[PDB]
């Protein structure tokens, strides 16, 4: 195929006013908005605010079920607690880091666009850390994302703090430290 | 609601010739059959053969995508390797134990029936072991399933062998041992 990798939501400024373009990006899951009519997943690389809003479209009950099961599995994979009906989650990153490799379809018309979900592959934090330590687009994104996350942690006013992560590992405490030295 | 818990596929003999009944069961994931038109997930409690065949229906591409993402997430959660197109997996248990709590809709007509997927909650093997060690329907099923799995391991002709599990843990080796004593 010819899937185009996007490193920032701003890339979408050079895209056609009316086209269907397969894209792919890497970011942290930051929010979920599940209703009975639609589902929007928000991701961000913190270049610090929501940036990518992916939509899971569904009209009938059969597809709604699939959307529900999808959200359920994604949340369970990241150890996110779900009450399963309008469901809303925000600033997920403040409590849990959820790196994700996502593939989407950019669909525009009249200059307006929507990113529809094609595939989402969660990335294990342990593998993310390892992948950065030992050692392309994916890796550049993972590095950039972690750097921003590092600057946000230094900033005293910013609500993001590693120590406040429900999964603050000893290994995470170790990677952050040895990661600031590079700075 | 009034979801009925089933402990065996044979229970479906007392069900209506034409009705929609919400059910729920616990079993191991044993097979996947993903095509471009349908998707069937096979589960078994090894009371030793496939027993529950759950279907994920989808007609259009939008719902097919959701089905794909669902299978992708379920497989990733269990560390199952997926090539992502007709996709087939069999005797998954011989390589990986994948306990699952599933909720389905029994839909019959003319005496024939189909179990459609409503929700699937994977169960961590570590939690399964713990839940059995420390210490209802769910627990009875988890115990029964593990007992059958234990007898299948004793049987020399049976292909199922704990030691051959890609995830044979030291803790798994320990739970099995201390579990045969109860027998």
């Amino acid at each position: 195929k010819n899937r185009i990798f996007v490193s920032s939501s701003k890339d979408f400024e050079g895209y056609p006013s009316k086209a269907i373009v397969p894209v792919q990006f890497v970011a942290l899951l930051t929010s979920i908005h599940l209703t009975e009519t639609k589902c929007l997943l928000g991701f961000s690389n913190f270049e610090q605010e929501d940036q990518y809003l992916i939509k899971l479209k569904f009209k009938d009950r059969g597809s709604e079920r699939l959307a529900r099961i999808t959200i359920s599995l994604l949340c369970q994979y990241f150890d996110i607690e779900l009450p399963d009906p309008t469901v809303i989650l925000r600033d997920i990153h403040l409590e849990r880091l959820c790196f994700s490799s996502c593939k989407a379809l950019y669909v525009s018309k009249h200059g307006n666009y929507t990113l529809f979900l094609e595939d989402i592959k969660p990335l294990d934090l342990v593998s993310v850390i390892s992948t950065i330590s030992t050692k392309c687009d994916l890796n550049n994104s993972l590095v950039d994302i972690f750097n921003n996350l590092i600057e946000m942690n230094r900033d005293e006013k910013n609500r993001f703090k590693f120590v406040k992560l429900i999964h603050y590992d000893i290994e995470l405490k170790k990677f952050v430290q040895d990661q600031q030295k590079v700075l | 609601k009034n979801r009925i818990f089933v402990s065996s596929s044979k229970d479906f003999e007392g069900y209506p010739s034409k009705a929609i009944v919400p059910v729920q069961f616990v079993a191991l994931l044993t097979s996947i059959h993903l095509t471009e038109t349908k998707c069937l997930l096979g589960f078994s409690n090894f009371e030793q053969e496939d027993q529950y065949l759950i279907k994920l229906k989808f007609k259009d591409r939008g719902s097919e995508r959701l089905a794909r993402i669902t299978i992708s997430l379920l497989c990733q959660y269990f560390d199952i390797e997926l090539p992502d197109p007709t996709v087939i997996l069999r005797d998954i248990h011989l390589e990986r134990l994948c306990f699952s709590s599933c909720k389905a809709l029994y839909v019959s007509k003319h005496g024939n029936y189909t179990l459609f997927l409503e929700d699937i909650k994977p169960l961590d093997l570590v939690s399964v072991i713990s839940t059995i060690s420390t210490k209802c329907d769910l627990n009875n099923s988890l115990v029964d399933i593990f007992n059958n799995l234990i007898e299948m391991n004793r049987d020399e002709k049976n292909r199922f062998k704990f030691v051959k599990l890609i995830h044979y843990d030291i803790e798994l080796k320990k739970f099995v041992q201390d579990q045969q004593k109860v027998l």
Binding site: K18, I20, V107, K109, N112 | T37, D60
Partner: peptide
């Protein structure tokens, strides 16, 4: 030939559905 007629149809409707969805309720408007 039958598995192809279906594909073409499904793909063709998919394109329309997605474009129609963006036209009625875009997630990002300008």
């Amino acid at each position: 030939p039958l598995k192809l007629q279906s594909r073409k149809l499904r793909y063709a409707n998919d394109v329309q559905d997605l474009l129609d969805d963006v036209e009625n309720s875009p997630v990002v408007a300008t």
